[PDB]
Amino acid sequence: CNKQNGVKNILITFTHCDTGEVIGPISHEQPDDTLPTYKTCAWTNTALTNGAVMRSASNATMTLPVVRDPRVPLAWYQGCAQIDAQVEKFDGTVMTLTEGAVTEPEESDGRAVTMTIIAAEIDELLPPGSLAA
Amino acid sequence: MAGPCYNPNEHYLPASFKGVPFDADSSDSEHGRNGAEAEFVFGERTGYADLGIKIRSYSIRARFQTNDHVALSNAFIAVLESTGPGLLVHPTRGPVMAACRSARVTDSKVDAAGVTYIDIDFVEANDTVTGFG
Amino acid sequence: ALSDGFVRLCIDPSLNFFGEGCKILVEGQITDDATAAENVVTCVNSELDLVERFGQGSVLTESLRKVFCMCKSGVSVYALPRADAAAAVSAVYTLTVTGTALTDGRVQLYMGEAEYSLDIGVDEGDTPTQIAAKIVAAISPDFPYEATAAAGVITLTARNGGTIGNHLSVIYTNLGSCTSVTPEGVTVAFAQTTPGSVNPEPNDYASVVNECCFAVYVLSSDDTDWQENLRDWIRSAWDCSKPQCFGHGYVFNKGTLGQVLADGDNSAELSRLALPTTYPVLPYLTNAAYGALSACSTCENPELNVQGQTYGLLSCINMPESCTPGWEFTEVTQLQNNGFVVSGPATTSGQGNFTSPYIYNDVTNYLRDEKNRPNATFRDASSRRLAAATGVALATFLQQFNGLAVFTKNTNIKTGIIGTNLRLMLGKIRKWASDNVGVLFSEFDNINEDIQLVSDFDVQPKCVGQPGVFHLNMRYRPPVRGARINVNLVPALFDN
Amino acid sequence: DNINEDIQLVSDFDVQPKCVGQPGVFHLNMRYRPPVRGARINVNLVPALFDN
Amino acid sequence: MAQDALSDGFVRLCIDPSLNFFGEGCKILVEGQITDDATAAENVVTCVNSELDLVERFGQGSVLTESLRKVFCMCKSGVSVYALPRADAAAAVSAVYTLTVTGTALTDGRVQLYMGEAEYSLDIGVDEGDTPTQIAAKIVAAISPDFPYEATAAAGVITLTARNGGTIGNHLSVIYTNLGSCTSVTPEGVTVAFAQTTPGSVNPEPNDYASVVNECCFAVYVLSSDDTDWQENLRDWIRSAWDCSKPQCFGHGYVFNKGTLGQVLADGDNSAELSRLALPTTYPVLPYLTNAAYGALSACSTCENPELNVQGQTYGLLSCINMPESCTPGWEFTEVTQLQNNGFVVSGPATTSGQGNFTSPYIYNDVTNYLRDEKNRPNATFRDASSRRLAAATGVALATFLQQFNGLAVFTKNTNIKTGIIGTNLRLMLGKIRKWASDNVGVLFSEFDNINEDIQLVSDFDVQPKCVGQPGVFHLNMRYRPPVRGARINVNLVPALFDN
Amino acid sequence: DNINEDIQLVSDFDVQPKCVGQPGVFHLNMRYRPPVRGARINVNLVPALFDN
């Protein structure tokens, strides 16, 4: 079953900034029917006149809606801790992020959290039989 | 700053002046070097001559939010007007000697009641002997 | 720390030297008076302890003196003294002085290395050959040769037996218009009378250096069999049958072109240094300098290459300029193509003035392969250092999977469990490999095919594998040291 | 591996012969496998070179 | 303990640059002559590891060694080489070639000769005039030791004799490159004449393929002889590997033919397994060197994906072979058209010029010698070489898919399967197969003209008469078409101009 | 050290046995640490001499 568009495993690893504590790669589950969205190219093109373009720095962004683990303070899920995430889709694609940070957190009711993460780069592992190197 | 493990209280020194603590809100500075650029007449070449260091200058902004801010704010102004220069703990430039050159105190009763801002403009002041050399 | 002046903070220093992560081992002969026990590795402190601990003018002391003078600090030294063979013979050299000094003047000689040079003034005019030969009273004690000062002729006898005392070529000023107020009418003749006989062949490396890690091995000898034993030992340190200690060795070979090329045993664990038959410096002194310079006193960065006139300058060695290059250019190319290391002067002159040598190519003695194919995988010495660094660094990274729950045959991990599966593990490793591009690897040709992870259940047949064992297969390539860009000039005399 | 065969519950009457079984006595059999954790990783490093 | 990081024993490290991650690629078999000094046994298939193992194992300058040298040079990785060394006949006669020098040098200059292949060409410069023919013939000191011929170095003339007896050494060629001097200064008054005096006569005819290659699947067979009878023996063996009597061992073979257009065309034998390379009587390169290079290139080095043709200036360039430039193509275009239409391979230089530099030929068309179907009716089903490769892949892939029906309950008399049974019948099996054929369209097949008639399935009972058919035996018939790819574009350019 | 474990609150009904406790009585257990007033740091000099 390789044509199913869905998420299989979500692993996160927090790192408290003020105490250096580290929590193993706990697993998570998603709150609703939405899926994470990704952006892996760290350059943005602006449209000039007559087909030209302009490049801008930009970053690599992630969006990870996940159910809060009842054994971790809600603050950690917001911008009070480092994050290291991994998402494994059903088809086989695996995408890893390290040294990410949360930006502009919004209020949450205690169960559903929608983290927005940014990192230098995101590594993608395509299923067997890729074309590009 | 990069990474989510930054700690602003650990990298910025606590401001002060003549020993009285105060809450800083901004930190600027100005450096340079005095030149003597000269361009000849009918010539395709120019010149230069370094002729000393330029006097620094610092500007800071302070905020008072605590209960009964007028007493503290109105009592801090009595220190800026004290005769002579004194030690200044710049939040980022470290301890230096400076003399206050101006200060504008902003306040309101209906637009913003309960917070007082005061801008400052410091100047480096190194003690000099009185016998002119 | 705990003191009378109580204050919020307490402090506690312990000692000065701290760079114990780098080690070097020096091996050589000793003399009778040495108090150090033979065949026992012992740490070496600064030069003060020398002489007494290893004898006066012994081969080991001279090698150690250069090692300390090149690496002032940042490395830790070790010594492995060895004793002479049972029936070793000592070489003898003769230096006869003739004629009567009929003018006031001075005589100066250069032997072995600049540190042993002497300069004495002829007592006066009309001093015969016997009052002359006072040179014996001037020769420095550290010289490995003993002067007897016979009647009219001075005899130099090696202080150590074996073939190690068969290298000399003297430079003097007792003729020609080089009138450093030269004493007119004096001449000197140089000749050899007896060679060395027997060298030791220790083979107990597995017992005295057992399970101890060293970075650079330095060997102050020219016995081919002795060097071969060292190569075999190093292989064992890089073997797959046990945890590895890694390391690298430095040796030298001296002789004509035909002789030197005959020592190419195709060893990737050694860096053989080639010298000509008329080298004006004692051989092992130069070899020690090269080893010490590359003995991590500069190579804390594995990527660094010890070459050129800037990084590969053996400053401590001073030798007068020779009258001929020694290694003809047609011969220099052959030696480099055969995996040898060649050194030469770092400055231009032909005056007989003083210069210093530097190293052209930092290359091991690697050629062909186990399957007999030719390649340059371990050509540059930096490849060996980088390979060791990758092995250690990779092992540390994988440590985080020790004691971690692993799920196979059902890849869905329950909520709240702390674990991982094959695909997630492979993805994490790929992230580490890519980030190191430009530090330990160059860009992979195909990163999707040069890394593979398979559980042991997929390798062994049914009901034979073990639970929780993986096989990791990886291929990499060190950075790129240059490329060739053929140019095609064109003057295009015509316009438009 | 197969939870349908790794757990069984049988009453006393079915095991013992007639007039020997006792009421309210059960025999329960079960086999289980403890958790698995990483134990060893074998690495086969294969260096190569960028020729010339 | 050793280093601390590796002491705990959680990680075992192994460093060896000789390890091979992937499985061995396709196998290529090379066959030819050897010399007495070779230590390899005759008529024994052996593996090969590196170039340096040659000479010692296959003699000095033998036919087999030269063929293997090119094969290793073309295939950098992804192939395993095997060798089958044969031996000279008892009554072999070695060819003899003579090269004479005339006149005497009178001006300084250089002379360079091209002997068979660029790797064996030599450059020798006469340093001074007044040097007679005897001061010349210093070439013998410059001839490569690995040259397949022996330099006699007689008085003023050098005699070249082949190291392997037979007709194989009857194709050498030497050219005076500097004759048309443009930049190089040739000496004045020096001339070189090349001629033959004795040809080879006897060739071996081994016929023991069924014993030495018994039941092992090779990919490519390369032969280094011009004997037609020897080539015919190889073709018969390959057919036995494609036969229907026993399990197949599909393979393909490469050979060459040299001579005039009349003689070469007479060698055709309507072989669907051989890829005959046609060469002219004035080919500067040694024939058996080009044959190996082409076959080696077509090996897994370029045929891991079976659908790739070996043509054009990109995918069919024998970069390992260099021959001098020339103004004469060798094959006239009319001759080229005739050869191509008769199932022969043709090659031509990459670039044409008169300067006399070196170039590498490339294949014009990749074709097999299949011209007429069985029962003598023409078609072009197996014209393209890739067609044979596709057929082998199609058969194997279909066989693997059909394995799922092994040991499956079947119903033929009453077609209603009761609830709970695991089984199938004729119609359901046919339906499943049809799905597979349609799914593979665009990968191994072109669209079926009428799939309802191109696939059929019949049980054994329906075919055999009463009380003769066995249970559980099925007959499957299929027709398929390989994919189509661009082959040629005709351009009719019609210029025009504005009205003045 | 661990604020989640150093403070506990239990009603008297959960300490005494059945029908022995009293209503509206609690037991509070707290563990604390006074402010730190010291620190020990050990130092090394390591005066280098090589260029890099």
Coordinates of C-alpha atoms in Angstrom, one line a residue, chain E residues 69-425:
Chain E
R69 CA 43.4 -4.9 -22.2
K70 CA 40.8 -3.0 -24.2
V71 CA 37.9 -4.7 -22.3
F72 CA 39.3 -3.5 -19.0
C73 CA 39.9 0.0 -20.4
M74 CA 36.3 0.4 -21.6
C75 CA 34.5 -1.1 -18.6
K76 CA 35.6 0.9 -15.5
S77 CA 33.1 -0.8 -13.1
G78 CA 30.0 -3.0 -13.2
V79 CA 31.2 -6.1 -15.0
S80 CA 33.0 -9.4 -14.3
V81 CA 35.5 -10.6 -16.9
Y82 CA 36.2 -14.3 -17.7
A83 CA 38.7 -15.8 -20.1
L84 CA 38.8 -19.0 -22.2
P85 CA 42.4 -19.4 -23.5
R86 CA 42.8 -21.6 -26.5
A87 CA 46.1 -22.8 -28.1
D88 CA 47.7 -22.7 -31.5
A89 CA 47.4 -25.6 -33.9
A90 CA 50.3 -28.0 -34.3
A91 CA 51.1 -27.1 -37.9
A92 CA 50.6 -23.3 -37.6
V93 CA 52.6 -21.0 -39.8
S94 CA 53.5 -17.6 -38.5
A95 CA 53.1 -14.5 -40.8
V96 CA 56.2 -12.6 -41.7
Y97 CA 56.3 -8.9 -42.5
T98 CA 59.2 -6.9 -43.9
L99 CA 59.9 -3.1 -43.5
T100 CA 62.9 -1.7 -45.4
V101 CA 64.7 1.6 -45.1
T102 CA 66.4 3.2 -48.1
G103 CA 68.7 6.2 -48.8
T104 CA 70.7 8.1 -46.3
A105 CA 69.8 11.0 -44.0
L106 CA 71.0 14.4 -45.0
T107 CA 68.8 16.8 -43.0
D108 CA 67.7 16.7 -39.4
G109 CA 64.1 15.6 -38.8
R110 CA 61.7 13.3 -37.1
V111 CA 59.9 10.1 -38.2
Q112 CA 56.9 8.6 -36.5
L113 CA 55.1 5.4 -37.4
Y114 CA 51.7 4.0 -36.6
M115 CA 51.8 0.3 -35.9
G116 CA 48.3 -1.2 -35.6
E117 CA 47.1 0.8 -32.6
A118 CA 48.0 4.1 -31.1
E119 CA 49.3 2.5 -27.9
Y120 CA 52.0 0.7 -30.1
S121 CA 52.9 3.6 -32.3
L122 CA 56.5 5.0 -31.9
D123 CA 58.3 8.3 -32.5
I124 CA 62.0 8.2 -33.4
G125 CA 64.0 11.2 -34.5
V126 CA 67.1 10.9 -36.6
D127 CA 69.5 13.3 -34.8
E128 CA 72.0 13.9 -37.7
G129 CA 72.3 13.6 -41.4
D130 CA 74.8 11.2 -43.0
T131 CA 73.3 8.4 -41.0
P132 CA 73.0 5.3 -43.2
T133 CA 70.2 2.8 -43.1
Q134 CA 72.1 0.9 -40.4
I135 CA 72.2 3.9 -38.0
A136 CA 68.5 3.9 -38.8
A137 CA 66.6 0.7 -37.7
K138 CA 67.0 2.0 -34.2
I139 CA 63.2 1.5 -34.2
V140 CA 63.8 -2.0 -32.9
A141 CA 65.0 -0.3 -29.7
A142 CA 61.7 1.6 -29.5
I143 CA 59.2 -1.1 -30.5
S144 CA 57.0 -1.8 -27.5
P145 CA 57.7 -5.1 -25.8
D146 CA 54.0 -6.0 -25.8
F147 CA 53.7 -5.6 -29.6
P148 CA 52.3 -8.9 -31.0
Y149 CA 55.2 -9.1 -33.4
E150 CA 59.0 -9.7 -33.1
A151 CA 61.6 -7.3 -34.4
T152 CA 64.4 -9.1 -36.1
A153 CA 66.7 -6.1 -36.7
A154 CA 68.5 -7.4 -39.8
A155 CA 71.0 -5.3 -41.8
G156 CA 69.1 -2.3 -43.0
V157 CA 65.7 -4.0 -43.0
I158 CA 63.5 -5.2 -40.1
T159 CA 61.4 -8.3 -40.3
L160 CA 58.3 -8.6 -38.2
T161 CA 56.8 -12.0 -37.4
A162 CA 53.7 -12.7 -35.5
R163 CA 53.9 -14.2 -32.0
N164 CA 50.8 -16.4 -32.6
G165 CA 50.7 -18.8 -35.6
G166 CA 47.7 -18.8 -37.9
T167 CA 45.7 -16.4 -40.0
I168 CA 45.1 -14.1 -37.0
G169 CA 48.3 -12.2 -37.5
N170 CA 47.6 -11.5 -41.2
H171 CA 46.1 -8.0 -40.7
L172 CA 49.0 -5.7 -39.6
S173 CA 49.4 -2.2 -41.1
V174 CA 52.1 0.4 -40.9
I175 CA 51.9 4.0 -42.2
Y176 CA 54.4 6.8 -42.6
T177 CA 52.5 9.4 -40.8
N178 CA 54.9 12.3 -41.4
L179 CA 54.9 12.0 -45.2
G180 CA 52.5 14.9 -45.6
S181 CA 54.6 17.0 -43.3
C182 CA 52.8 20.2 -42.0
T183 CA 54.6 21.1 -38.8
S184 CA 56.9 18.1 -38.0
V185 CA 60.1 18.2 -39.9
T186 CA 60.6 14.9 -41.6
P187 CA 64.2 14.0 -42.6
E188 CA 65.1 14.4 -46.3
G189 CA 66.1 11.4 -48.3
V190 CA 64.6 8.8 -46.0
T191 CA 61.8 6.5 -47.1
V192 CA 60.1 3.4 -45.6
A193 CA 58.4 0.6 -47.5
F194 CA 56.1 -2.0 -45.9
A195 CA 55.3 -5.4 -47.4
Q196 CA 54.4 -9.0 -46.6
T197 CA 56.3 -12.2 -47.5
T198 CA 54.5 -15.2 -45.9
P199 CA 50.9 -15.6 -44.6
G200 CA 49.5 -17.8 -41.9
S201 CA 47.8 -21.0 -42.9
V202 CA 46.4 -23.1 -40.0
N203 CA 43.8 -22.2 -37.4
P204 CA 42.3 -24.2 -34.5
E205 CA 38.7 -25.4 -34.6
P206 CA 37.6 -26.2 -31.0
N207 CA 34.2 -27.8 -30.5
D208 CA 34.1 -28.5 -26.8
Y209 CA 31.8 -25.6 -25.7
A210 CA 29.2 -28.0 -24.2
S211 CA 31.8 -29.3 -21.7
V212 CA 33.7 -26.1 -20.6
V213 CA 30.7 -23.7 -20.5
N214 CA 28.2 -26.4 -19.3
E215 CA 25.2 -24.7 -17.7
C216 CA 26.4 -21.3 -16.8
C217 CA 24.7 -18.1 -17.9
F218 CA 27.0 -15.6 -19.6
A219 CA 25.8 -12.3 -21.0
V220 CA 28.2 -11.5 -23.9
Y221 CA 30.6 -13.7 -25.9
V222 CA 33.5 -12.2 -27.7
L223 CA 35.6 -14.1 -30.2
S224 CA 39.0 -13.0 -31.4
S225 CA 39.4 -15.1 -34.7
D226 CA 38.3 -14.6 -38.3
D227 CA 37.9 -18.3 -39.1
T228 CA 34.3 -18.7 -40.4
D229 CA 34.2 -22.3 -39.2
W230 CA 35.2 -21.2 -35.7
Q231 CA 32.6 -18.5 -35.7
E232 CA 29.9 -21.0 -36.8
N233 CA 30.7 -23.2 -33.9
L234 CA 30.1 -20.3 -31.5
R235 CA 26.8 -19.5 -33.1
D236 CA 25.5 -23.1 -32.7
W237 CA 26.4 -23.0 -29.0
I238 CA 24.5 -19.8 -28.4
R239 CA 21.4 -21.2 -30.1
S240 CA 21.5 -24.2 -27.7
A241 CA 21.2 -21.6 -24.9
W242 CA 18.1 -20.1 -26.5
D243 CA 16.5 -23.5 -27.4
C244 CA 13.1 -24.8 -26.2
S245 CA 14.4 -28.3 -25.2
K246 CA 15.7 -27.3 -21.8
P247 CA 15.9 -24.2 -19.5
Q248 CA 17.3 -21.2 -21.4
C249 CA 20.7 -19.5 -20.8
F250 CA 20.1 -16.5 -23.0
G251 CA 23.3 -14.8 -24.4
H252 CA 24.6 -12.9 -27.3
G253 CA 27.9 -13.0 -29.2
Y254 CA 30.0 -10.6 -31.2
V255 CA 32.3 -11.3 -34.2
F256 CA 33.9 -9.5 -37.1
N257 CA 34.4 -10.0 -40.9
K258 CA 37.0 -8.3 -43.1
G259 CA 37.4 -8.2 -46.8
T260 CA 35.9 -6.7 -50.0
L261 CA 32.2 -6.0 -50.2
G262 CA 31.8 -9.1 -52.3
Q263 CA 33.5 -11.4 -49.7
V264 CA 32.0 -9.9 -46.6
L265 CA 28.4 -10.2 -47.9
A266 CA 29.1 -13.9 -48.6
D267 CA 29.7 -14.5 -44.9
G268 CA 26.1 -13.7 -43.9
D269 CA 24.2 -16.7 -42.4
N270 CA 21.0 -15.3 -41.1
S271 CA 22.1 -15.6 -37.5
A272 CA 19.9 -14.0 -34.8
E273 CA 22.7 -14.3 -32.2
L274 CA 25.8 -12.9 -33.8
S275 CA 26.5 -9.2 -34.3
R276 CA 28.8 -9.2 -37.3
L277 CA 31.1 -6.2 -37.6
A278 CA 32.1 -5.5 -41.2
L279 CA 35.5 -3.9 -42.0
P280 CA 37.3 -3.0 -45.2
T281 CA 40.5 -4.4 -46.6
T282 CA 42.3 -1.2 -45.7
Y283 CA 41.5 -0.9 -42.0
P284 CA 44.4 0.7 -40.2
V285 CA 43.5 -0.9 -36.8
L286 CA 44.0 -4.5 -35.9
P287 CA 40.6 -6.2 -36.4
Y288 CA 40.3 -8.1 -33.1
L289 CA 41.0 -5.0 -31.1
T290 CA 37.9 -3.2 -32.3
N291 CA 35.7 -6.3 -31.9
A292 CA 36.5 -6.6 -28.2
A293 CA 36.1 -2.8 -27.5
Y294 CA 32.6 -2.8 -29.1
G295 CA 31.5 -6.0 -27.3
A296 CA 32.9 -4.7 -24.0
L297 CA 31.0 -1.4 -24.4
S298 CA 27.7 -3.3 -25.0
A299 CA 28.3 -5.2 -21.8
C300 CA 26.7 -4.1 -18.5
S301 CA 28.7 -0.9 -18.8
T302 CA 25.9 0.3 -21.1
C303 CA 23.2 -2.5 -20.9
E304 CA 22.1 -2.7 -17.3
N305 CA 18.9 -1.3 -18.8
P306 CA 18.2 -3.6 -21.8
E307 CA 16.3 -1.0 -23.8
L308 CA 19.3 1.2 -24.6
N309 CA 20.7 1.1 -28.1
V310 CA 24.4 1.5 -28.8
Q311 CA 24.5 4.1 -31.6
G312 CA 25.2 7.7 -32.2
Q313 CA 28.3 9.7 -31.3
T314 CA 27.5 9.6 -27.6
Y315 CA 26.4 6.1 -26.6
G316 CA 28.5 4.3 -29.3
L317 CA 31.9 5.9 -29.0
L318 CA 34.9 3.6 -28.6
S319 CA 37.0 6.2 -26.8
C320 CA 39.7 3.5 -26.0
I321 CA 40.6 3.1 -29.7
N322 CA 42.6 5.7 -31.7
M323 CA 43.4 5.6 -35.4
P324 CA 44.9 8.3 -37.7
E325 CA 42.6 10.7 -39.6
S326 CA 42.3 10.3 -43.3
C327 CA 40.4 11.8 -46.2
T328 CA 39.1 8.5 -47.5
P329 CA 36.1 7.0 -45.6
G330 CA 37.0 3.4 -46.4
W331 CA 33.4 2.5 -47.1
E332 CA 31.7 4.3 -49.9
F333 CA 28.2 5.5 -48.9
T334 CA 26.6 3.2 -51.4
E335 CA 28.5 0.3 -49.9
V336 CA 27.4 1.5 -46.4
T337 CA 23.8 1.4 -47.4
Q338 CA 24.1 -2.1 -48.8
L339 CA 25.8 -3.4 -45.7
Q340 CA 23.3 -1.9 -43.4
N341 CA 20.4 -3.4 -45.2
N342 CA 22.0 -6.8 -44.9
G343 CA 22.3 -7.0 -41.1
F344 CA 25.9 -5.8 -40.8
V345 CA 27.4 -3.3 -38.3
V346 CA 29.3 -0.3 -39.7
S347 CA 31.7 2.1 -37.9
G348 CA 33.1 5.5 -38.9
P349 CA 35.5 8.1 -37.6
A350 CA 34.2 10.7 -35.2
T351 CA 35.9 13.5 -37.1
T352 CA 37.4 13.8 -40.6
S353 CA 40.5 15.7 -41.5
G354 CA 43.8 15.5 -43.3
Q355 CA 46.1 16.7 -40.5
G356 CA 46.8 13.0 -39.5
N357 CA 45.8 13.3 -35.8
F358 CA 44.1 10.6 -33.8
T359 CA 40.3 9.9 -33.6
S360 CA 38.1 7.2 -32.2
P361 CA 35.5 5.5 -34.4
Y362 CA 31.8 5.1 -33.3
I363 CA 29.1 2.7 -34.3
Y364 CA 26.6 3.7 -37.0
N365 CA 23.9 1.2 -36.2
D366 CA 23.4 -1.6 -33.6
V367 CA 22.0 -4.5 -35.6
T368 CA 22.0 -8.3 -35.6
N369 CA 22.4 -10.6 -38.5
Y370 CA 18.7 -11.6 -38.4
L371 CA 17.2 -11.1 -41.9
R372 CA 14.7 -13.9 -42.6
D373 CA 12.2 -15.5 -40.4
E374 CA 11.9 -19.3 -40.2
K375 CA 10.0 -20.8 -43.2
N376 CA 11.7 -18.1 -45.4
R377 CA 9.5 -15.1 -44.9
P378 CA 11.2 -11.7 -44.4
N379 CA 10.6 -9.4 -41.4
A380 CA 12.5 -7.3 -38.9
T381 CA 11.4 -8.6 -35.6
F382 CA 15.0 -9.2 -34.3
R383 CA 16.7 -6.5 -36.4
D384 CA 17.6 -4.3 -33.5
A385 CA 20.1 -5.8 -31.0
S386 CA 17.9 -4.4 -28.1
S387 CA 15.1 -6.7 -29.3
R388 CA 17.0 -9.8 -28.2
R389 CA 17.7 -8.3 -24.8
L390 CA 14.1 -7.3 -24.3
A391 CA 12.9 -10.8 -25.2
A392 CA 15.2 -12.4 -22.6
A393 CA 13.9 -9.9 -19.9
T394 CA 10.3 -10.4 -21.0
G395 CA 10.6 -14.2 -20.6
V396 CA 12.2 -14.1 -17.2
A397 CA 9.8 -11.5 -15.9
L398 CA 6.8 -13.4 -17.1
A399 CA 8.1 -16.6 -15.6
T400 CA 8.6 -15.0 -12.1
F401 CA 5.0 -13.7 -12.2
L402 CA 3.5 -17.0 -13.1
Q403 CA 5.2 -18.7 -10.1
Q404 CA 2.3 -17.7 -7.9
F405 CA 0.1 -20.4 -9.6
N406 CA 2.4 -23.2 -8.4
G407 CA 0.5 -25.7 -6.2
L408 CA -2.8 -23.9 -6.4
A409 CA -6.1 -25.7 -6.4
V410 CA -7.8 -25.6 -9.8
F411 CA -11.2 -26.5 -11.1
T412 CA -11.9 -27.4 -14.7
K413 CA -15.0 -29.7 -14.9
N414 CA -17.2 -27.6 -12.5
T415 CA -16.1 -24.0 -12.3
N416 CA -18.0 -23.1 -9.1
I417 CA -15.5 -22.8 -6.2
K418 CA -17.2 -23.5 -2.8
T419 CA -17.0 -21.0 -0.1
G420 CA -13.7 -20.9 1.8
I421 CA -11.6 -22.8 -0.8
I422 CA -8.3 -21.3 -2.1
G423 CA -8.2 -21.9 -5.9
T424 CA -8.9 -20.5 -9.3
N425 CA -10.0 -21.6 -12.8

